[PDB]
Amino acid sequence: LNRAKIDSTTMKDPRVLNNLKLRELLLPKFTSLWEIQTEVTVDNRTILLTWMHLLCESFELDKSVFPLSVSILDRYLCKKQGTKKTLQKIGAACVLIGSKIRTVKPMTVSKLTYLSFTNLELINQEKDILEALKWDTEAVLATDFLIPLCNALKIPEDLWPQLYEAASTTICKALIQPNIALLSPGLICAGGLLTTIETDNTNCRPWTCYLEDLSSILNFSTNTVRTVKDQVSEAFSLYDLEIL
Amino acid sequence: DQQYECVAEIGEGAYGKVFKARDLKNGGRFVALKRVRVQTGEEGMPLSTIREVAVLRHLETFEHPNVVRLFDVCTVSRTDRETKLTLVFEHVDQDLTTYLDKVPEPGVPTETIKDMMFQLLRGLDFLHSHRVVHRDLKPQNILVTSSGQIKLADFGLARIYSFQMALTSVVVTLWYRAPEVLLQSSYATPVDLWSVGCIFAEMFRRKPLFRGSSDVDQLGKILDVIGLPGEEDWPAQPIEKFVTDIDELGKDLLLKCLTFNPAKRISAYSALSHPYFQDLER
Ligand SMILES: CC(=O)c1c(C)c2cnc(Nc3ccc(N4CCNCC4)cn3)nc2n(C2CCCC2)c1=O
Ligand SMILES: [Ca+2]
DSSP states (O other), X not given: OEEOOOOHHHHTOHHHHHHHHHHHTTXXXXXXXXXXXXXXXXXXXXXXXXXXXXXXXXXXXXXXXXXXXXXXXXXXXXXXOOOHHHHHHHHHHHHHHHHHHHOSSOOOHHHHHHOOOOHHHHHHHHHHHXXXXXXXXXXXXXXXXXXXXXXXXXXXXXXXXXXXXXXXXXXXXXXXXXXXXXXXXXXXXXXXXXXXHHSSOTTXXXXXXXXXXXXXXXXXXXXXXXXXXXXXXXXXXXXXXXXX | OOSEEEOOOOOOOSSSEEEEEXXXXXXXXXXXXXXXXXXXXXXXXXXXXXXXXXXXXXXGGGOOTTBOOEEEEOOBOOSSSOOBEEEEEEOOSEEHHHHHHHOOTTOSOXXXXXXXXXXXXXXXXXXXXXXXXXXXXXXXXXEEOTTOOEEEOOOTTOEEOOTTOEEOSOOSOXXXXXXXXXXXXXXXXXXXXXXXXXXXXXXXXXXXXXXXXXXHHHHHHHHHHHOOOOTTTOOOOOGGGTSTXXXXXXXXXXXXXXXXXXXXXXXXXHXXXXXXXXXXXX
16 A cells, blocks of 8 residues: 655665666577567467556556566566467466566466466466576566666656656556567666657656767667657557457 | 485574575585475465565676575475475574674674674665665574674565555564554665664664564654654654663764654665774775
């Protein structure tokens, strides 16, 4: 019931931003998403990712659960081979694992199975992800960068709550899409922010004005930044529950 | 599964118990074994355990000197029974508790006091700068190696903090809880420093400072010492009484961690730089 309020230590310390970027360099580069796969396509992924998204959204889980569900799922689908009649399970086990870490009230098995395989059969599909990833579960989420970026960009604090709520919502959806899976979490975030800023100016400066800065903050070129915005702004638009 | 043999039980941790044991395939040296009996109810691996490993794994490529190390997770699934877990860490000789209990008179040397404090804050700094709050900081969780080095242990209540995230109103053990938690308020990192305030003191006076029994009493106990603050700070008695044998700069630091308002309470980073510490590693 209580929520995490602003904490200068965790939010305004420049070296926090500094370490996100660093720990971003830990999970290495998917040269191509789901290459190891010899059955399920990326199309299957978009579908399972919107089911997993809907799950998180409708049960109102903390915003950082889904991105991490995605990250687990992906990491996991190199280490092992997935199937079509089995993805539902796997994705279900990612949300279940993600919820266990990043949210106080985690998605229960009975909640997850009943909606969707036996609950025994799901417990294994957890075990099997855990040991496959060798319990190294956590990850830098595109989410994690939101406030550290608002702070770095000198955005007034009273805007943080809305800005947070709004751009986390758009990042989360964007993540559903194939091509977004390849971008660095810092960038996905910078994109999320700018798109959001664009639609209802929120009484900041306008989108334009933050492009050169995020390029300085993150240490990419401006073109890269301008691109990732369009890219994430796209990913958002392509959300569609009918595909289910 | 069969690389070990348990000796003494060095304490009942997060879910069950933690044993002292030796590794065989290695140099023959010591390993810390956490036994986790997963209830064949229906929730999968315990929340607390999954989280705690994930955080420790996540930071391990930093190899921070003031944090415990995890080597392995056994897992052996049983079709004849429930699962059981072997969680395997570096062994450390004793905790702060036993050490405070064993130390010759007249207690721990002030220069050790300063150093343990230092290391402790240092490990904390680290943890916070990676957005981890170790919200279960107590003498039993603080580990002292043979060379007298500090390791933060039991990460089963630690979690990565993000704005607007949901919180359990129920964190830290009674004695070392902060007013914000007691008041059922929202909380974060300053929580760890409150604990370090309490611990700092427990070092000089080899006895816990705030020994409550209810939350309400636990709060009064605190307020009996630190004093009632203003309307501003709500969302005495001179300390030296409760903490004799403390230096003037040790005091200022100690108050700075034991600030009622959290947003006023000092941070590890600024605490690491407080004038109490100049004398140390230099
Ligand atoms: C899983 C952990 O993080 C962990 C580890 C790695 C650790 C290692 N060495 C310890 N070494 C110890 C710990 C305690 C003692 N004393 C033994 C005699 N009685 C009091 C404690 C001696 N050696 N203790 C450890 N703990 C204890 C903290 C609470 C319960 C376990 C831990 O959680
Ligand atoms: Ca929740």
